[PDB]
Write a protein that binds this ligand. Structure first.
Ligand SMILES: [Mg+2]
Ligand SMILES: [Mg+2]
Ligand SMILES: [Mg+2]
Ligand SMILES: [Mg+2]
Ligand SMILES: [Mg+2]
Ligand SMILES: [Mg+2]
Ligand SMILES: [Mg+2]
Ligand SMILES: [Mg+2]
Ligand SMILES: [Mg+2]
Ligand SMILES: [Mg+2]
Ligand SMILES: [Mg+2]
Lengths: 129, 205, 122, 80, 82, 156
RNA sequence: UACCCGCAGAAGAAGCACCGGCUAACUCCGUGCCAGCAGCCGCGGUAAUACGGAGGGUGCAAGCGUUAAUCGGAAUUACUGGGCGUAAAGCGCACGCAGGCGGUUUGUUAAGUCAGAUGUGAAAUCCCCGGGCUCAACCUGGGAACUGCAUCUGAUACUGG
RNA sequence: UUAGCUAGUAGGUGGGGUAACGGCUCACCUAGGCGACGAUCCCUAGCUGGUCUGAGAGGAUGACCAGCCACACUGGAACU
């Protein structure tokens, strides 16, 4: 039973990067598009696009820099069954600022750094390094 | 609370000169500082990381004139103070009244500077201090009592101290034999042969 | 394993028992000798190590070991049992600290006198 | 303005009283797990009208007999 | 009754009496309601010996509080000085 | 010029028809006070030959690490067959708080302030490879900015 | 009384533990698996730098060692921070209650979450900045902290109704 | 390797009693109340601010002091 779509997306992109794939098509979602927007903004991916009327499908394009995959480690944090909620003071920092610790809060899902800048906490979604 | 034995066995065990003698003669011409004291000083074994850390700590302690308890207290103070732990430890060790008296040159050795401090001979800001660990604040004035200003020992120490390189963080004037403490000494001002990383690691162990 | 299983069954500790049961968290215990004798240690070691079955004042009766060289212990002797085991003696879990009420210090010893209750020579 | 709680009634086989089962969400201090905890209370409601199955709203008051220190304020979602 | 008195929180030969509004039935150095300044009979010059808060002392003494013998003298001295 | 430290010498032995023959294995680590660091594992019949064989292989297998001025960039973890090392940067005056074979490799790699901890089998042969792999896989602000398309000021 | 002044003389004042590896420090003499050491590896069968004595060195210091108790190392109960093919670990298998989780879009609410404010979290204690005993220990002023709870006001990206 | 406990016990009506709310207690009525989110039973144990160890998370602990609780040879009771 598919009980976590975010984990499925992370697994798909991590396997595509390992297998040196070009595009990873998957069934999309509102949160998937919101996370893909953050990935495009942070430059960890190359492009994301939602193509579908009745069943929307996200087709992300993998980004490669001199052979090495741009994303080093993708990790789910607040998996279903263990929810993590940290305030503004205790927001995580991935790889001493070299990685993102994406946070979802009231003002959308922008990123950990933007959440700290705005002064609001939230729930951790994905660690991308 | 201080070492009451020979002052050169420690130096020859450490391997270098710890400034525990006056300086009228040469250390090599006065003792046999090339090997450890005892029957097996010539035999040189291999020392581990713990061995070299302990040797560095003992060298620092013998140079400055402190015991294990006081040295650990100074290390804790340096650790709690923000900044470089080794630099803070060196500054705290240098801030002792006997050490600044030795720098001014009122005593041949630190064991004599502290003896003068304890024998009611040092008059700091008009108040006598008998503590060899008395911390000296910036812009502090250290002087000598009347009953010790006209001694032969202080004059001999002052004229002998001209051989060494004068410290750059004191402004002692010999006309009245009184000194003023300037900005605290730094790692570059002090000797660069003292490895403070070994000191900070030995206590971290 | 899983967080739900951990919440259900807590990650419990593992209590370890002390190796000196007859002390009851006490450094020294005064007792009276009952059986003074010598025993042969386990192989490969071989000796005539002097031990003593002694009943403590609390009610426990254990066997301790006599250190040094030469002692004046026998039946109906007051000793001070101290906590410490001997590896090569099966059953011995304690010693008798010297310099106590009756177990005098070792004779003709001038090194490590703290552990054997020997006075400072003149 | 005044504090009040909401729960589910589980038993009312008594005169002018009901038994409520309030559910709360807490985080586990050790494992950080969100589990549902229950706080059952003895609530007295004069002129008995609440059955079993619906949710009720209660307010803290003085003790009445030995252990019911709560009163019913409103009846929301009475549907079975 | 409710009174404002002195509780010694110094050391051997070093008295230091904090001014506390403590009930008369409680201990000298035990329970108290609030603390109003302090007093140091050993402190020399250049040191602020007394820091009693006159506003809160008056606010308490209005509601039936009793000022102790030495506390009243210290308050009088503080008022005379400044 | 370059600094070198051999960490542990072993006494591995074989068995033959006429008895058991002896041998020696030496593990050495070489560096130059900068990001260049390497390890070598020599096998010979005596300790000097073993260490001299290990030194050459260490020098020829030296690798580069993008370390900072006095410490590392970001905390990193290295996973080998039986060793799991975790290293993190520290501040001025903390020193090299590391144990086992990690202290020597960090000292020859030039990091002066670092906190390291090893979990698992702490044998030098595996822990050296674990820490070398952990140090070689760490990133730098310039490299991550180049690979992501952003700037070092943007990703601070 | 603190404190200070003059007396005269170096006097009235240093001991304890260890020295094969862990761990900082090696050489001789005495027995001879005996005396014995021992926290683990282990030593004593004519010299074991491992026992006792001596020299020497090492460490601490008016303290030095042992014992009694807790924790770290022990990631060796692992929430941070582990495993189950073979080192200990998939129930013999299936159904299924409570319980745990839950595909996708929108609307409603705001319980969980987040931000702000108030009350409080006694004093004492830790930390930071300063002051007083010749100095430290000690005392002391302010700040921070007490990571918690309740209430009120705003958000619905996420979980839940 | 402690699965049932409770008949003043759950609640209600009426009266009496403390400074007041109160099965605090009697007289009637409805058989309920608690329990796998651990009732009942057994052993041990004063609680807390704090203390020690640990980078933290945690573990142990309650010396002095401070706040609270309980007890004055043991049990029972009442008066001012
Ligand atoms: Mg040894
Ligand atoms: Mg395991
Ligand atoms: Mg098997
Ligand atoms: Mg098996
Ligand atoms: Mg199976
Ligand atoms: Mg001061
Ligand atoms: Mg407090
Ligand atoms: Mg919803
Ligand atoms: Mg009745
Ligand atoms: Mg632990
Ligand atoms: Mg009595």
């Amino acid at each position: 039973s598919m009980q976590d779509p975010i984990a499925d997306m992370l697994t798909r992109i991590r396997n595509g990067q390992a297998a040196n794939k070009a595009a990873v098509t998957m069934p999309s979602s509102k949160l998937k598009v919101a996370i893909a927007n953050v990935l495009k903004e942070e430059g960890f991916i190359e492009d994301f696009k939602v193509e579908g009327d009745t069943k929307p499908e996200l087709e992300l394009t993998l980004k490669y820099f001199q052979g090495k995959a741009v994303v080093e480690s993708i990790q789910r944090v607040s998996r279903p069954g263990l929810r993590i909620y940290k305030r503004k003071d205790e927001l995580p920092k991935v790889m001493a600022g070299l990685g993102i610790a994406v946070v979802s809060t009231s003002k959308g899902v922008m990123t950990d750094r933007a959440a700290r800048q705005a002064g609001l906490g939230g729930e951790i979604i994905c660690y991308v390094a | 609370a201080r070492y009451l034995g020979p002052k050169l066995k420690l130096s020859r065990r450490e391997g270098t000169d710890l400034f525990l003698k006056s300086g009228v003669r040469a250390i090599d011409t006065k003792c046999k500082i090339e090997q450890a004291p005892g029957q097996h000083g010539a035999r040189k074994p291999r020392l581990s990381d713990y061995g070299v850390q302990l040797r560095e700590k003992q060298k620092v302690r013998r140079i400055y004139g402190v015991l294990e308890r006081q040295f650990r207290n100074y290390y804790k103070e340096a650790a709690r103070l923000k900044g470089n732990t080794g630099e803070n430890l060196l500054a705290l060790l240098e801030g002792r009244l006997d050490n600044v008296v030795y720098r001014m040159g009122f005593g041949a050795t630190r064991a004599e500077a502290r003896q003068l401090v304890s024998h009611k001979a040092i008059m700091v800001n008009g108040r006598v201090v008998n503590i060899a660990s008395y911390q000296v604040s910036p812009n502090d004035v250290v002087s000598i009592r009347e009953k010790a200003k006209k001694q032969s020992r202080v004059k001999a120490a002052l004229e002998l101290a001209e051989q060494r390189e004068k410290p750059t963080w004191l402004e002692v004037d010999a006309g009245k034999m009184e000194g003023t403490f300037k900005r605290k000494p730094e790692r570059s001002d002090l000797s660069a042969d003292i490895n403070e990383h070994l000191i900070v690691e030995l206590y971290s162990k | 394993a899983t967080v739900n299983q951990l919440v259900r069954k807590p990650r419990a500790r593992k209590v370890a028992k002390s190796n000196v049961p007859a002390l009851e968290a006490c450094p020294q215990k005064r007792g009276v000798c009952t059986r003074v004798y010598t025993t042969t240690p386990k192989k490969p070691n071989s000796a005539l190590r002097k031990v003593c079955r002694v009943r403590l004042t609390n009610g426990f009766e254990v066997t301790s070991y006599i250190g040094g060289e030469g002692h004046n212990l026998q039946e109906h002797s007051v000793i001070l049992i101290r906590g410490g085991r001997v590896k090569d003696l099966p059953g011995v879990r304690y010693h008798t600290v010297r310099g106590a009420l009756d177990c005098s210090g070792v004779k003709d010893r001038k090194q490590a006198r703290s552990k054997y209750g020997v006075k400072r020579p003149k | 303005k005044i504090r009040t709680l909401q729960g589910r009634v589980v038993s009312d086989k008594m005169e002018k009283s009901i038994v409520v089962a309030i559910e709360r969400f807490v985080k586990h201090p050790i494992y950080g797990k969100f589990i549902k905890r229950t706080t059952k209370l003895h609530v007295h409601d004069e002129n008995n009208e609440c059955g079993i199955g619906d949710v009720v709203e209660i307010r803290e008051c003085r003790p009445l007999s030995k252990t019911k220190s709560w009163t019913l304020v409103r009846v929301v979602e009475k549907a079975v | 009754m409710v009174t404002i008195r002195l509780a010694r929180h110094g050391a051997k030969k070093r008295p230091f009496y904090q001014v506390v509004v403590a009930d008369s039935r409680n201990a000298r150095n035990g329970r108290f309601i609030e603390r109003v300044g302090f007093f140091n009979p050993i402190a020399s010059e250049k040191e602020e010996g007394t820091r009693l808060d006159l506003d809160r002392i008056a606010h308490w003494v209005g509601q039936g509080a009793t000022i102790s013998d030495r506390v009243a003298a210290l308050i009088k001295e503080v008022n005379k000085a400044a | 010029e370059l600094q070198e430290k051999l960490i542990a010498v072993n006494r591995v032995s074989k068995t033959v028809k006429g008895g058991r023959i002896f041998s020696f294995t030496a593990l050495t680590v070489v560096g130059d006070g900068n990001g260049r660091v390497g390890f070598g594992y020599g096998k010979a019949r005596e300790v000097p030959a073993a260490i001299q064989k290990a030194m050459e292989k260490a020098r020829r297998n030296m690798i580069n690490v993008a370390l900072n001025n006095g410490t590392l960039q970001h905390p990193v973890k290295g996973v080998h067959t039986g060793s799991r090392v975790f290293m993190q940067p520290a501040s001025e005056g903390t020193g090299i708080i590391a144990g086992g074979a990690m202290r020597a490799v960090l000292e020859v790699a030039g990091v002066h302030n670092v906190l390291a901890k090893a979990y698992g089998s702490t044998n030098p042969i595996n822990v050296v490879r674990a820490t070398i792999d952990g140090l070689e896989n760490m990133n730098s602000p310039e490299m991550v900015a180049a690979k992501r398309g952003k700037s070092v000021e943007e990703i601070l």
